[PDB]
Amino acid sequence: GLSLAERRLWVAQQLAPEDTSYNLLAHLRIVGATADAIEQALRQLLERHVALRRRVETPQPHALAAHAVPLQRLLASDAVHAERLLEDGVRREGARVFDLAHEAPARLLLVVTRDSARADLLLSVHHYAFDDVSLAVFAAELKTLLDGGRLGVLASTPEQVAARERAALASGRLDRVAERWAERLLPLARAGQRLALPVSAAVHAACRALAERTSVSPFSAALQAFAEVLGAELGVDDLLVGVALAGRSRLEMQGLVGCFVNLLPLAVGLRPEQSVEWRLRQVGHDLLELLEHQDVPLECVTQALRQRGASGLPIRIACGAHAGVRVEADFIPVPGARLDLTLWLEDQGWLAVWTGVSAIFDLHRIERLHQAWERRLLANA
Numbered sequence: 001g002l003s004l005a006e007r008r009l010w011v012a013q014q015l016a017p018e019d020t021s022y023n024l025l026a027h028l029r030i031v032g033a034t035a036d037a038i039e040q041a042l043r044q045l046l047e048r049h050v051a052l053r054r055r056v057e058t059p060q061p062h063a064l065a066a067h068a069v070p071l072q073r074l075l076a077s078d079a080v081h082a083e084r085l086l087e088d089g090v091r092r093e094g095a096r097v098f099d100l101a102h103e104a105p106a107r108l109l110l111v112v113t114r115d116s117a118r119a120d121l122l123l124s125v126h127h128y129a130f131d132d133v134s135l136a137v138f139a140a141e142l143k144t145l146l147d148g149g150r151l152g153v154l155a156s157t158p159e160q161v162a163a164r165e166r167a168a169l170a171s172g173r174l175d176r177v178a179e180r181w182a183e184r185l186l187p188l189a190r191a192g193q194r195l196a197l198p199v200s201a202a203v204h205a206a207c208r209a210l211a212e213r214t215s216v217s218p219f220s221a222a223l224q225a226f227a228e229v230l231g232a233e234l235g236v237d238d239l240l241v242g243v244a245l246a247g248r249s250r251l252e253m254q255g256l257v258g259c260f261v262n263l264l265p266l267a268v269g270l271r272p273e274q275s276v277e278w279r280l281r282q283v284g285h286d287l288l289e290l291l292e293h294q295d296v297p298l299e300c301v302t303q304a305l306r307q308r309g310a311s312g313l314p315i316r317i318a319c320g321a322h323a324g325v326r327v328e329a330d331f332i333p334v335p336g337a338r339l340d341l342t343l344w345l346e347d348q349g350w351l352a353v354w355t356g357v358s359a360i361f362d363l364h365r366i367e368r369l370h371q372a373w374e375r376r377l378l379a380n381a
């Protein structure tokens, strides 16, 4: 069977079969390897990571052979021609509808430049079989094989992860955590614009000093100012904020390729009664609680809320944080905006990636929102 992390994306795809916003596109840039070596290493990674080569019967996964994953190889006359071939592949793979019932969820395009040590790999994979950490695992093991190294035995599989979850659900310990959370969250129960903006050095240092003298993670300070600015504009004293989590709750899950991401809600109180340092401590603690219980699926919290008389949980805002052969891997952002507004922090200083629904945000309003967020952080510190 599929895990609930895999199922929620597979189900959402079945609800809108022509929606391509679950297609993940990863561009890998490789320097110092031959085309034959890259193709050979890629086939080993496909055999190693079964999630990249399964089909789904209407929902039961079934493994396919590694040679059944399409891999196209093209020779570019020069570096600019290689750019045009990748851009063509980006547009084509972004529009492709995956046949998840009969074909592997992954496709590969290897572009080699003549008289050059640079190759270019475009990996398109449906989101039910991939996530952000999977790309880092994939890119790291690619460089390992291209360097001549060896890979260790995998500790688990997506099927084992789904099995352990089936047990933890029947044991009821996941629902008991969700039922506790449902108490705190009960009162609260498209075209998009994306803009990446650097976090200023002063805001970076203020966020660290505020986090050190308060004994919380700097992300907690960033999440607090994030919730405070939006809650002030919204006119509410309580703000529901989803937190994107890697969902890899054990050591055996840290090296798997597949879909394990989870979205869990927390509530930020915006009462002027509480101090700034105390609201930060409450946010940092609730954040650590979500990280400690990453394996509690979102459907359990929804189940617990519907048991208390609510129709569901309307999450509108969310946030998250991201020698030898040279390998760089970067996702190409998915267009659209399922949620009204998300903030993602990535490392280099840090980089703030804002995605807002176009009905509320244009690019200029996003820049103003980023500045208000930086000011709130400097003020909070």
Ligand SMILES: CCCCCCCCC(=O)N(C)C[C@H](O)[C@@H](O)[C@H](O)[C@H](O)CO
Pocket (backbone or CB within 6 Å): 229, 230, 233, 234, 316, 317, 340, 341, 360, 365, 366, 368, 369, 370, 372
């Ligand atoms: C799902 C989220 C829904 C709520 C969205 C809240 C957007 C907040 C925002 O835009 N700022 C804080 C930037 C600036 O400080 C403001 O003065 C704008 O100019 C003002 O809103 C006019 O555009």
